[PDB]
Enzyme design. Sequence first.
Site, PDB file in Angstrom:
ATOM      1  N   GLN B 103       0.636  -1.376   0.187  1.00 27.25           N
ATOM      2  CA  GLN B 103       0.712   0.271   0.080  1.00 27.25           C
ATOM      3  C   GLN B 103       0.589   1.068   0.287  1.00 27.25           C
ATOM      4  O   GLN B 103       0.603   2.643  -0.434  1.00 27.25           O
ATOM      5  CB  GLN B 103      -1.169  -0.008   1.077  1.00 27.25           C
ATOM      6  CG  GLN B 103      -1.882  -0.729   1.449  1.00 27.25           C
ATOM      7  CD  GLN B 103      -2.991  -0.660   2.343  1.00 27.25           C
ATOM      8  OE1 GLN B 103      -2.680  -0.712   4.008  1.00 27.25           O
ATOM      9  NE2 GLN B 103      -4.256  -0.797   2.067  1.00 27.25           N
ATOM     10  N   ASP B 126       3.917   1.270  12.213  1.00 29.01           N
ATOM     11  CA  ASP B 126       2.804   1.329  12.792  1.00 29.01           C
ATOM     12  C   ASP B 126       2.635   2.764  13.503  1.00 29.01           C
ATOM     13  O   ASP B 126       3.044   3.498  14.308  1.00 29.01           O
ATOM     14  CB  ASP B 126       3.742   0.468  14.405  1.00 29.01           C
ATOM     15  CG  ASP B 126       2.442   0.057  15.280  1.00 29.01           C
ATOM     16  OD1 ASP B 126       0.989   0.448  15.399  1.00 29.01           O
ATOM     17  OD2 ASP B 126       2.692  -1.741  15.129  1.00 29.01           O
ATOM     18  N   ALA B 127       1.096   2.818  13.218  1.00 28.74           N
ATOM     19  CA  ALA B 127       0.597   3.718  14.862  1.00 28.74           C
ATOM     20  C   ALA B 127       0.591   3.313  15.522  1.00 28.74           C
ATOM     21  O   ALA B 127       0.049   4.842  16.429  1.00 28.74           O
ATOM     22  CB  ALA B 127      -1.189   3.970  14.289  1.00 28.74           C
ATOM     23  N   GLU B 144     -11.006   4.605   9.076  1.00 19.83           N
ATOM     24  CA  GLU B 144     -11.659   2.829   9.064  1.00 19.83           C
ATOM     25  C   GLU B 144     -10.668   2.432   9.562  1.00 19.83           C
ATOM     26  O   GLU B 144     -10.534   1.055   8.951  1.00 19.83           O
ATOM     27  CB  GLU B 144     -12.383   3.250   7.543  1.00 19.83           C
ATOM     28  CG  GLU B 144     -13.604   3.626   7.499  1.00 19.83           C
ATOM     29  CD  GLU B 144     -14.084   3.593   6.035  1.00 19.83           C
ATOM     30  OE1 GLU B 144     -13.513   2.309   5.592  1.00 19.83           O
ATOM     31  OE2 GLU B 144     -14.745   4.320   5.932  1.00 19.83           O
ATOM     32  N   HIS B 148      -7.636  -2.178  13.052  1.00 23.77           N
ATOM     33  CA  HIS B 148      -6.494  -3.091  13.086  1.00 23.77           C
ATOM     34  C   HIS B 148      -5.686  -2.631  14.259  1.00 23.77           C
ATOM     35  O   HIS B 148      -5.010  -3.936  14.634  1.00 23.77           O
ATOM     36  CB  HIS B 148      -6.121  -2.881  12.246  1.00 23.77           C
ATOM     37  CG  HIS B 148      -6.946  -3.002  10.841  1.00 23.77           C
ATOM     38  ND1 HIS B 148      -7.417  -4.305   9.935  1.00 23.77           N
ATOM     39  CD2 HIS B 148      -6.545  -2.093   9.520  1.00 23.77           C
ATOM     40  CE1 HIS B 148      -7.968  -4.693   9.192  1.00 23.77           C
ATOM     41  NE2 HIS B 148      -7.662  -2.984   8.032  1.00 23.77           N
TER      42      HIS B 148
HETATM   43  C1  LIG Z   1     -14.898   0.049   2.811  1.00 21.97           C
HETATM   44  C2  LIG Z   1     -15.745  -1.070   4.062  1.00 21.97           C
HETATM   45  C3  LIG Z   1     -14.949  -1.899   3.835  1.00 21.97           C
HETATM   46  C4  LIG Z   1     -15.355  -3.634   3.390  1.00 21.97           C
HETATM   47  C5  LIG Z   1     -13.331  -2.075   3.853  1.00 21.97           C
HETATM   48  C6  LIG Z   1     -12.304  -1.058   4.545  1.00 21.97           C
HETATM   49  C7  LIG Z   1     -12.009  -0.929   5.982  1.00 21.97           C
HETATM   50  C8  LIG Z   1     -11.260  -2.054   6.731  1.00 21.97           C
HETATM   51  C9  LIG Z   1     -10.606  -3.851   6.187  1.00 21.97           C
HETATM   52  C10 LIG Z   1     -11.555  -1.897   8.163  1.00 21.97           C
HETATM   53  C11 LIG Z   1     -15.172  -2.696   5.705  1.00 21.97           C
HETATM   54  C12 LIG Z   1     -14.861  -3.851   6.195  1.00 21.97           C
HETATM   55  C13 LIG Z   1     -14.261  -3.666   8.100  1.00 21.97           C
HETATM   56  C14 LIG Z   1     -14.883  -2.518   8.260  1.00 21.97           C
HETATM   57  C15 LIG Z   1     -14.867  -1.529   8.547  1.00 21.97           C
HETATM   58  C16 LIG Z   1     -15.368   0.397   8.568  1.00 21.97           C
HETATM   59  C17 LIG Z   1     -15.458   0.255   7.622  1.00 21.97           C
HETATM   60  N1  LIG Z   1     -15.124  -0.068   6.872  1.00 21.97           N
HETATM   61  C18 LIG Z   1     -15.045  -1.186   6.699  1.00 21.97           C
HETATM   62  C19 LIG Z   1     -15.271   0.047   9.759  1.00 21.97           C
HETATM   63  C20 LIG Z   1     -14.589  -0.316  11.511  1.00 21.97           C
HETATM   64  C21 LIG Z   1     -13.406   0.862  11.933  1.00 21.97           C
HETATM   65  O1  LIG Z   1     -12.524   0.489  13.004  1.00 21.97           O
HETATM   66  N2  LIG Z   1     -14.473  -1.706  12.123  1.00 21.97           N
HETATM   67  C22 LIG Z   1     -15.720  -2.294  12.326  1.00 21.97           C
HETATM   68  O2  LIG Z   1     -15.863  -2.984  13.487  1.00 21.97           O
HETATM   69  C23 LIG Z   1     -16.002  -3.133  11.083  1.00 21.97           C
HETATM   70  C24 LIG Z   1     -18.014  -3.418  10.451  1.00 21.97           C
HETATM   71  C25 LIG Z   1     -17.227  -4.522  11.103  1.00 21.97           C
HETATM   72  C26 LIG Z   1     -18.042  -2.770  11.360  1.00 21.97           C
HETATM   73  N3  LIG Z   1     -14.943  -3.281  10.321  1.00 21.97           N
HETATM   74  C27 LIG Z   1     -13.753  -4.619  10.733  1.00 21.97           C
HETATM   75  N1  LIG Z   2      -0.930  -1.023  13.322  1.00 23.77           N
HETATM   76  C1  LIG Z   2      -1.415  -0.002  12.276  1.00 23.77           C
HETATM   77  N2  LIG Z   2      -0.554   1.334  11.786  1.00 23.77           N
HETATM   78  C2  LIG Z   2      -0.770   1.875  10.942  1.00 23.77           C
HETATM   79  N3  LIG Z   2      -1.899   1.537   9.910  1.00 23.77           N
HETATM   80  C3  LIG Z   2      -2.359   0.451  10.247  1.00 23.77           C
HETATM   81  C4  LIG Z   2      -2.461  -0.708  11.443  1.00 23.77           C
HETATM   82  N4  LIG Z   2      -3.580  -1.537  11.544  1.00 23.77           N
HETATM   83  C5  LIG Z   2      -3.710  -0.919  10.056  1.00 23.77           C
HETATM   84  N5  LIG Z   2      -3.247  -0.032   9.054  1.00 23.77           N
HETATM   85  C6  LIG Z   2      -3.310   0.630   8.249  1.00 23.77           C
HETATM   86  O1  LIG Z   2      -4.422   1.258   7.718  1.00 23.77           O
HETATM   87  C7  LIG Z   2      -5.040   0.859   6.496  1.00 23.77           C
HETATM   88  C8  LIG Z   2      -6.968   0.778   6.570  1.00 23.77           C
HETATM   89  S1  LIG Z   2      -7.661   0.215   4.818  1.00 23.77           S
HETATM   90  C9  LIG Z   2      -7.720   2.036   5.462  1.00 23.77           C
HETATM   91  C10 LIG Z   2      -7.263   2.645   4.153  1.00 23.77           C
HETATM   92  C11 LIG Z   2      -7.201   4.205   4.124  1.00 23.77           C
HETATM   93  N6  LIG Z   2      -7.443   4.618   5.285  1.00 23.77           N
HETATM   94  C12 LIG Z   2      -8.189   4.671   2.968  1.00 23.77           C
HETATM   95  O2  LIG Z   2      -9.722   5.052   4.026  1.00 23.77           O
HETATM   96  O3  LIG Z   2      -8.678   4.374   1.881  1.00 23.77           O
HETATM   97  C13 LIG Z   2      -4.816  -0.066   6.098  1.00 23.77           C
HETATM   98  O4  LIG Z   2      -3.694   0.307   4.992  1.00 23.77           O
HETATM   99  C14 LIG Z   2      -3.652  -0.586   6.816  1.00 23.77           C
HETATM  100  O5  LIG Z   2      -2.850  -0.503   6.481  1.00 23.77           O
END
Ligand SMILES: C=C[C@@](C)(CCC=C(C)C)c1ccc2c3c(c[nH]c13)C[C@@H](CO)NC(=O)[C@H](C(C)C)N2C
Ligand SMILES: Nc1ncnc2c1ncn2[C@@H]1O[C@H](CSCC[C@H](N)C(=O)O)[C@@H](O)[C@H]1O
Lengths: 282, 281, 281, 279, 279, 279
Positions: B103, B126-127, B144, B148
Amino acid sequence: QQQVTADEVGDWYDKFGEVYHLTLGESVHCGLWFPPDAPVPQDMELVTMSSQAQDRYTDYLIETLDPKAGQHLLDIGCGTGRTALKAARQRGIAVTGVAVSKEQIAAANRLAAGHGLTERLTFEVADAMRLPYEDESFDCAWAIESLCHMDRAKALGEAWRVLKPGGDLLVLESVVTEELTEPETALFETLYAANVPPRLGEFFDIVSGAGFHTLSLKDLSANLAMTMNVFALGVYSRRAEFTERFGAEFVDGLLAGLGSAQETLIRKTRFFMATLRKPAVL
Amino acid sequence: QQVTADEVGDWYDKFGEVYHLTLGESVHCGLWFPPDAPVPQDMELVTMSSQAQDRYTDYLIETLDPKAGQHLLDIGCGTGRTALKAARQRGIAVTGVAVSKEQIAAANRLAAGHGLTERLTFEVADAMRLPYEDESFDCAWAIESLCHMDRAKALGEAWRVLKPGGDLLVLESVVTEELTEPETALFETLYAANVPPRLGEFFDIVSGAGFHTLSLKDLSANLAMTMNVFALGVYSRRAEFTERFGAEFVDGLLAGLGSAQETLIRKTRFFMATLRKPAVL
Amino acid sequence: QQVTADEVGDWYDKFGEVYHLTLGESVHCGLWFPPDAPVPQDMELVTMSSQAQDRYTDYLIETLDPKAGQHLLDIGCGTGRTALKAARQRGIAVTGVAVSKEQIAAANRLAAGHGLTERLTFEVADAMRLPYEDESFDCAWAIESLCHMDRAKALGEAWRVLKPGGDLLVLESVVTEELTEPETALFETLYAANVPPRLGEFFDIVSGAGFHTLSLKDLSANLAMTMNVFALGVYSRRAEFTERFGAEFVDGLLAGLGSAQETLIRKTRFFMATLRKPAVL
Amino acid sequence: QVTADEVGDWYDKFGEVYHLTLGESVHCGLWFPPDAPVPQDMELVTMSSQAQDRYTDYLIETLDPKAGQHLLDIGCGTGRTALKAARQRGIAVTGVAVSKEQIAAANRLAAGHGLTERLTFEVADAMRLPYEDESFDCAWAIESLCHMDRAKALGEAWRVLKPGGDLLVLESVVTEELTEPETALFETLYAANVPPRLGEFFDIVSGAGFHTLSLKDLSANLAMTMNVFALGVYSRRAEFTERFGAEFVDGLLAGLGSAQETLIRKTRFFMATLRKPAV
Amino acid sequence: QVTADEVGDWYDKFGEVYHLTLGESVHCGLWFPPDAPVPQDMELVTMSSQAQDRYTDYLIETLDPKAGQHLLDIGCGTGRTALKAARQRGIAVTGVAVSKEQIAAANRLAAGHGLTERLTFEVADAMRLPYEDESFDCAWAIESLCHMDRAKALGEAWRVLKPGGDLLVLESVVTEELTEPETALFETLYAANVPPRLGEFFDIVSGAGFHTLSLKDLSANLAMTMNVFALGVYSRRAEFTERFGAEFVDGLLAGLGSAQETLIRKTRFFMATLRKPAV
Amino acid sequence: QVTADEVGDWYDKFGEVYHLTLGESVHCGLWFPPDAPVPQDMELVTMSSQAQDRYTDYLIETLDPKAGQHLLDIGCGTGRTALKAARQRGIAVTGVAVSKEQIAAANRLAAGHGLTERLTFEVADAMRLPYEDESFDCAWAIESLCHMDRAKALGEAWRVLKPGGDLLVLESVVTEELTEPETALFETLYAANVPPRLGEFFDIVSGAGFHTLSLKDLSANLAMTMNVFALGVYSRRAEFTERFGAEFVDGLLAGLGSAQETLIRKTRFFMATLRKPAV
Ligand SMILES: C=C[C@@](C)(CCC=C(C)C)c1ccc2c3c(c[nH]c13)C[C@@H](CO)NC(=O)[C@H](C(C)C)N2C
Ligand SMILES: Nc1ncnc2c1ncn2[C@@H]1O[C@H](CSCC[C@H](N)C(=O)O)[C@@H](O)[C@H]1O
Ligand SMILES: C=C[C@@](C)(CCC=C(C)C)c1ccc2c3c(c[nH]c13)C[C@@H](CO)NC(=O)[C@H](C(C)C)N2C
Ligand SMILES: C=C[C@@](C)(CCC=C(C)C)c1ccc2c3c(c[nH]c13)C[C@@H](CO)NC(=O)[C@H](C(C)C)N2C
Ligand SMILES: C=C[C@@](C)(CCC=C(C)C)c1ccc2c3c(c[nH]c13)C[C@@H](CO)NC(=O)[C@H](C(C)C)N2C
Ligand SMILES: C=C[C@@](C)(CCC=C(C)C)c1ccc2c3c(c[nH]c13)C[C@@H](CO)NC(=O)[C@H](C(C)C)N2C
Ligand SMILES: C=C[C@@](C)(CCC=C(C)C)c1ccc2c3c(c[nH]c13)C[C@@H](CO)NC(=O)[C@H](C(C)C)N2C
Ligand SMILES: Nc1ncnc2c1ncn2[C@@H]1O[C@H](CSCC[C@H](N)C(=O)O)[C@@H](O)[C@H]1O
Ligand SMILES: Nc1ncnc2c1ncn2[C@@H]1O[C@H](CSCC[C@H](N)C(=O)O)[C@@H](O)[C@H]1O
Ligand SMILES: Nc1ncnc2c1ncn2[C@@H]1O[C@H](CSCC[C@H](N)C(=O)O)[C@@H](O)[C@H]1O
Ligand SMILES: Nc1ncnc2c1ncn2[C@@H]1O[C@H](CSCC[C@H](N)C(=O)O)[C@@H](O)[C@H]1O
Ligand SMILES: Nc1ncnc2c1ncn2[C@@H]1O[C@H](CSCC[C@H](N)C(=O)O)[C@@H](O)[C@H]1O
C-alpha cells in the site's frame, strides 16, 4: 494488541487489499451513499435504506416539477400511492393516481385512508392510454417509471389532453443508446413487463408529436444502475423466501436474467428525468 | 409495444410486491447520487462506488477543515488517494503511515504520478509506536483503521504527535450488543479483526489518551451500503477473485459475508467523531 | 473635533492593549448576531440574549426535526416557550413536564395566550417517575434539565415513554477534570446541583437505558457566553435583584459566579446529543 | 445529588432571574453559529476574538475585493483585519494609523506570514493621507472615523480611490441630541468626537463625492461587544490597574455604566458601502 | 409640484400602459439578482455585459472544467468566455472561429491579460477541425452551431474529445414548421441555418456518438437579449449607419420585429451537455 | 445552407455591433436566474411580469412580515403586490391609492382570489391617512413616494405604524442638480415630484421619527425596467395611440430617451427599511 498483530494486518493487505479496490473503488473506505443532512434510518436492512433513498428520490421529483398548493396532480401509473401521498402532504395539493393493478390501487386507497387524506388522494384503476378524465382537468402530472409498460405515443397524447395549457408533465424514462439484440429485447418482457425503450431522437419525436415542448432533461442513469444492483442483491440473498412467495419459475427467471439485464442496462441504455410543457395557448 | 394493459395489470398483482421487499415502500429508483454530482464515466459498480468514496473523502475534508500550510497525519493511509485529495484541495502537506509495504508503495507511486512527492510522504510505520516526534502535526485522521489497532495505544500515539489545540478525525465502529464468540472470530477471519469497543468504553479510551470530544455523527448506513456493494461484487465475480486471491480466500468471504452483514446491521454502529487535543492557554 | 491625531495616537499607545485583552486579537466589534438575523426591538442585554435563545430553539427544532402530527415530550419544559415555538413551526402536539408549579402555570397561560391549549399540555410531573404510559410519544427532548435529575432514571423513563424508533434530543454537560469538593458544592448552592458525569460514564448510562447514539455536537462556547451574560446582568443589577429575590440569594450568586465561570471553562463541556430508541424487528 | 422537590421550590422562587437576565426562555443562546469552530479555549477574550474574526470575514465578503487589487485600511489597528483580507483574497493591503505601537504590532504580522511585498503598515494621518491620487481599488474605515474629522478623512479617502472603487465604512450615528456629560464621556473613555446625525453624515458622504450603495445596521453587535468589554473590565479590575494604572480603570468603571445606556438609547451603528463614481 | 387629485386622474387614464408594458404589477422587475454587484454605469450595453458575464459564469459552473484540463471553444468569438474560464478554473483554452477579426481580437485579449500560454486562438472551421484525435478534455459551442452543419460539427467535436469528456452546447430548435420568409430572415439578418427540430437534433447528436446528459431551456434569456439588441439598434440608427452602412442597419430595422415574433412563437433555446462515451 | 467564408466575412464587418449593444461578450445575458421557471410565453410583457413577481418576492423576503400581522400598502396600485404578500405570509393587507380605477381593479383581484376578508383596498391619500394611530404592524411604499410630499407621507406612515414596526420604502434620489427641463419631464412623463437628495431624504426620514436599518441600491433594475418600458412604447405606437390618444403617446416618444439619460446619469434608486422605534 487484540486478536491481530500489525505484521498480520500488513501481510493481509499485501495479499488482499486489492480486493477492496476492485469492488469499492480507488480508495479503501466507505462511500457516501446517504448525504449528511439525511436522517438515520429506522433499521439497516437493504430494503429500508433503499426505501429512504426512494423517499429522497420522490422529494427530488416534487422539487423539480414544483406543484403549487391548491393544484391538482395526475400520477400516471401511481403504483401503491406513496409518491402521491408525499406530494400531497408536502405541497398541499390534490392528487389523482391511476394504475392497471387492482391490488395496487386498493393499497393506495388503504394508504390514503390510513393518513386521513381520502379527500385529496383519489386512486382508480384506469389505463393511461385511455384516461377516464376530461380535457384540461390537471395542473400537472408525472409518469414515474411507467411509460415502459405503455404505448408512449398514446400515453403522452392522453397526458397532453388531460393537462391544462401551460402545465407540465414530469417524465422519468429510459432510452437505448446501442441497438439491442433480440435476447435483450426479450428480457424486457420476461423479467419486468416489456416494451424496449425507444431511441433518444425517437422519444422526443413522440414528445413533439404529442404537442409537448421540452424544458429540461437530466441523466439519472447511475441511480437506475445502483437500484438494479440493490434489487439483484436482494433476490440473490433471499431466493428461498422469494420462491415460497412468488414461485420457482419466477424467481429462477430473475436469477438467470438479472446479470445479463444489468450489463445491458450499463452498456446500452440511459435513464433520465425530463420536464415537458403543454404550450400555453394555441 | 410488447405488452398490453391487462398483462401488465396481472404482472403487478402477482409480483409487484417483490419491489417492496427489495427496493422499499415505493416502486422506483433511489437517489443514490445527489443531483449536483457528475455523471460517472462507467456504470460499473466499482466506478459508481469509487465516486461515492471520493464524495466521502470530500466530506471528511470539509468536516476536519485543514487549513493551508498545515501538516496532516493520515493514520492508516491505505494507498493514499485520501491524502492526495486533501493535499490538492487545501494546500497542505500530508504524512501517511501504514503497515503494508504494498500500500505504501502504491501511495508513493500516486504522489509521484501527481507530482506531489514534496507534499505527500508515505512511510511504513505502526500507529501504535509512531516514529514521529512530539507535537509534529497540526491535525490527523484515522479513517476506518482503528479496528486493526489497539485503540488505546493508537489514540495516545496520535495525541502525542499532535500539536496542542489541533484535531484528530476518527471514523470508528462500536458494538451495541454483546457479540457471540463466532461473531468476534469473523472480524479476524474476514477482515483483520479487533472487535469494536463499546461506546462508553471507546470514549473512556478517548478521555484516557487526553482527548476532548467535539463531535460525533452516525454514518452506519454508508457502512452497511458499502458492505453490501462489497458483498455483491464478491458474489458476482467469484471466478475472477479466486483466480486472483485463491479459492481459500474467496470461499471464506462467500461463507462469512452474509452473517457478518447481519451482525453489522443488528449489533454495531459506525460514526465520524472529532477529537481535540486541548490547547494550553 | 474634540480630539487631535496626536491625542488619539497617544491613547492607543497607552491603552489599546485593554481592547486586545478584553475583545480579542482585533480592535473591532464581534459578529455576535448573524447577518440574516433581524434587528432587535431594543438593545437591552436581556432582549438580545432572548433572541439568541430563540435561534437556539430554532436550531434544536431543525436538529430533532419533528414531523407534522407527531407528539413531543418536553422533559423539563420550563415556561414552555420552547414547546410553543416547536408547536407553531412544525404542527405538532407537545406535552411538557416540570416539577415547578409556577413554571407549569406560566406555561399553561402561554398556551392559552397563543390559543394552543389543545396542542400544548403542561403538567407538574417528575421525569424520573413519568406518569404517561409506554410508547406514548414520537420524540422528546431534555433541554438543559438533566442536571437536576438522576440521569439513569430520567433517561430510562424517557426511553420507556418513547415509541420505538423515536429520537430524544439531549442538552447535557460533562466534566473533563475531577472537580474539587468546593466546586461540586457550588453546583448545589448556585443552581440545583448534580455535578456533571464523565463522557464515558454518561454514555454507559445512555447505553444502559437502551439508547443508541446518533449525534453529538459541542456547544460549550454558547453555554460560556450565556453564563457570562448571566453574570453581567447580576453584577449590573444587584440592587434590583436583592429587592426581588432577597440579599441572601444575590450575594450567594455574587460570591460564586466567578469561581463557577472558571470551573465551567476549564473542567466541563456542553453538547447536544441525539439518542435513538431502537426500532422494530 | 438533589431531590425533585428542592428543584421545584428553587424555580418557584428564583426562576424569573433567568427571564430578567437571559430572556423569555430558560436556556442558552446561540451566540456562535452552528458551522463555527470550537474555540481553542472558553475564555471571554478568545470567544470574543472568534466573533471578531467572523466579523472580519463578513466585511471582506461585503466589500468583495478582487485578486490583484490594492486596499486601504484607514485606521488599520494592529492589522489582523488587513492580514485576513490579504490571505483570503490574494490582495495588497496598506494600513495606516496614528499610533506607533499599533503600526509596530502590525508590521509584526506582515513579517511572519511572509508577504511585505503585499502587506504594508505606516504611521500616517487619515485627514492628511500621504499617498498619490487614484492609487487604490477599494478601502475601508473600520470603526475608525470617530477619531477623525469625517469630512476631511472621507474627502481624503475619495481622492486616493480609483473611480469605480468602493469605500466600506463602519460608522455610528446619533438618534437623539446627546447631553453634555454624554458628549464628554465620548472623550474621557475612548478618543472622542461625538457621532453625527444620519442625514448629516450622508451630506458629508455626498460632499466628499460618494454615492451610497448599501447600509446595514450592526448596532446589536456593538452593544454586545461593549457588554463583553464591560464584563472584562469589571471582572479584572486588579489586573488592569496593575497595568494601565488606577486612573484608567476607575474612570472606565464609572463611564461604562452611563455609557452603555447612551449607546443603547441614543446611537446606531452600521456598515455602509460608498462608491466613487466612474464615468 | 403635483397633487393627489391629479396623480389619481393620471392613473385612471394611463395605468393600463404600465400593465401593458411591464406586467401584472406597476413596479420594477428584478433583472439583476440581489447578490450581483452595482454596474460601473447604467448604459444598456453595460448592464447587458454584466448579464453576459453572469451567463458565462453559469456555463463555467455547468461544464465544470477542472484545473489542468484543455478546453476547446468551438466558435470562440472574441474570447472573453475563454478568458474567464481560464482565470477561474486554471485551465488551458484553445478557441477556433472563422473570423480573422475576432481571432485577432481574442489573441489581443489574451496578450493584454498575460495568458497567451494558456489561451490559444486560431482561425479554423469547426466542421473541419485540424486537431488530433482525443486532444481535449472538454469543449463547448456557445451559440455558434447555427452557423454550421450540425452533423459535421458535432462529429468533428466528438473526434477531438478524449473519451469521457463533455461538450456543452447552446443551440436553438424550432417547434413549428417555419415559412419561407422566416427561413430567409435567418440568412439575411444573422448568418443563417434554420434550427433543426428536437428529435432531429438528437438524431444528429446520437449519430455523432454522443450521449445526452442534460438539457435546460434558456429561451427567455435569448428573447430578452434579442430585445436588448433590437432596442439598441432602434435607439442608435444614426450611429450604426455611420459605422456599418445604411444597407445593414435598414435590414435590421426592417426584420428585427418579425424575427422577434418568430423567435417567440416557433423556436426554443437550450443549454445541453453531451458526453463522449468512455470505454 | 450558408457557408463558413460568408459567416467569417459577416463577423469581420458586423461583429462589433454586438459589443456595442450586448457587451464585452457575444452571447446571451443571464436575465433570468437558473432556478426561475420557464415563462408561459416570450412576450416582453410576460417576461417582465415574471421579473416583477420575483421583485415582489424579494420585498416580501426583505420586510419579512409574519403570519397574522396587518400590513399597510401605501400606493397599492392594482393590488398584486398585496395579494402575493397575503398568500405567502398569511397576513392581512390594507392598500390605499388615489386612483378609483386602480382600487377597483384591486378589489376585483381580492374577490377573484377569494381574499376579500384579508385584502382591503380603499381610495385614500397617504398624506392624510384615515386610519387610527398604531394600527399596522408593518407597511411599505413601493415606488409611490415620488407622487407625494415625502415629509407628510412618511410622518403619516409613522403615525399609523405600531412601535417597533417596520416600513419598507422604494425611493429614488438625485445625485446631480437636475436642469429645469428634466424636472419638467418628471411632471409630464409620469406624475412628477423631482426626487430629493440623499441627506435631504434622510433628514426627512429622521424628521418623521424613523430609524434607518438598511439601504440597498437597485438602480440597475429601475434602469432596465425603464428600457423595457421604452421599447414597448416604441414598438406599439399604433396600439397605444388607439388606446390612450396620440397626445399621450407622442409625449412618451418625445421624452423617454431624455428621461432615460437623466435617470442613468443623475439619479439612484434604492430599497430602505425604516423602523418606528419601540418603547
Ligand atoms: C470500506 C469497507 C470495508 C469493507 C473495507 C475497508 C476497511 C477495513 C478493512 C477496516 C470495511 C470492512 C470492515 C470494517 C470496516 C469499517 C469501515 N469499512 C470497513 C469500520 C471499522 C472501523 O474501525 N470497524 C468495524 O468494526 C467494521 C465493521 C465490521 C463494523 N470493519 C471491521
Ligand atoms: N497498526 C497499524 N498502524 C498503521 N497503519 C495500520 C495499522 N493497522 C492497519 N493499518 C492500515 O490502515 C489502513 C486501513 S484500510 C483504510 C485505508 C485508508 N484509510 C483509506 O481511506 O483508503 C490500511 O492501509 C492498513 O495498512
Ligand atoms: C426501481 C427499479 C425497478 C427495478 C422497478 C420499478 C420500475 C419498473 C418495474 C418499470 C425498474 C425495473 C425495470 C426498469 C426500470 C426503470 C426504472 N425502474 C425500473 C426505467 C424504465 C422507465 O420506463 N425503463 C426501462 O427500460 C428500465 C430498464 C430496463 C432500463 N426498466 C424496465
Ligand atoms: C442558561 C443557563 C443557565 C444559567 C440557566 C438554565 C439552566 C439550568 C439552571 C439548569 C444554566 C445554569 C447552570 C447549568 C446550565 C446548563 C445549561 N444552562 C445552565 C447545562 C447543564 C445541563 O444539564 N449542566 C451543567 O452542569 C451546567 C453547568 C454548571 C456546566 N448547569 C448546571
Ligand atoms: C469594539 C468596540 C470598542 C470598545 C473598541 C474599538 C473601537 C474604537 C475604540 C473606536 C468601541 C468603543 C467605542 C466606539 C466604538 C465603535 C465601534 N467599536 C467601538 C463605533 C465608533 C465608530 O466610529 N463610533 C462610536 O461613536 C462608538 C460608540 C460610542 C457608538 N465608539 C466611540
Ligand atoms: C446574442 C444574441 C445574438 C443576437 C448574437 C450572437 C449569436 C449569433 C449571431 C449566432 C443571436 C442572434 C441570432 C441567433 C442567436 C442564438 C443566440 N444568440 C443569437 C441562438 C442560435 C444558437 O445556434 N440559434 C438560433 O437559431 C438563433 C435564433 C434565431 C433563435 N440565432 C441565429
Ligand atoms: C417601474 C417603472 C415605472 C416606469 C412605472 C411605475 C412607477 C411609477 C410611475 C412611480 C417608473 C416610472 C417613473 C419612476 C419610477 C420609480 C420606479 N418605477 C418608476 C422610482 C420613483 C420612486 O419614488 N422615483 C423616481 O423619481 C422615478 C425615476 C424618474 C427615477 N420615477 C418617477
Ligand atoms: N397502461 C397503464 N396504464 C396505467 N398504469 C399503468 C399502465 N401500465 C403500467 N402501469 C402502472 O405503472 C406503475 C409502474 S411501477 C411505478 C409505480 C409508481 N410510479 C412509483 O413511483 O412508485 C405500476 O403501478 C403499473 O400498475
Ligand atoms: N486620524 C487618524 N488617522 C488614521 N488612523 C487613525 C486616526 N485616528 C485613529 N486612528 C486609528 O484607527 C484605529 C481605530 S481602532 C480600529 C482598529 C482596526 N481598524 C480594527 O478593526 O481592528 C486605531 O488603531 C487608531 O490608531
Ligand atoms: N426531576 C425533574 N423532572 C422533570 N422536570 C424537572 C425535574 N427537575 C427539574 N426540572 C425542570 O427542568 C427545567 C430546567 S430549566 C430548562 C427549561 C426549559 N427546558 C427551556 O428550554 O427553557 C426546570 O424548569 C425544572 O422545573
Ligand atoms: N463554421 C464555423 N467554424 C468555426 N467557427 C464558426 C463557424 N461559424 C461561425 N463560427 C464562429 O462562431 C461564433 C459565433 S458568435 C459566438 C461567439 C462566442 N462563442 C461567445 O460566446 O462570445 C463567431 O465568432 C464565428 O466566428
Ligand atoms: N398621494 C397618494 N396617496 C396614496 N396613493 C398614491 C398617492 N399618490 C400616488 N399614489 C399611488 O401610488 C401608486 C404608484 S404606482 C405603484 C403601484 C404599486 N405600489 C406596485 O407596486 O405595483 C399608484 O397606484 C398611485 O395611485
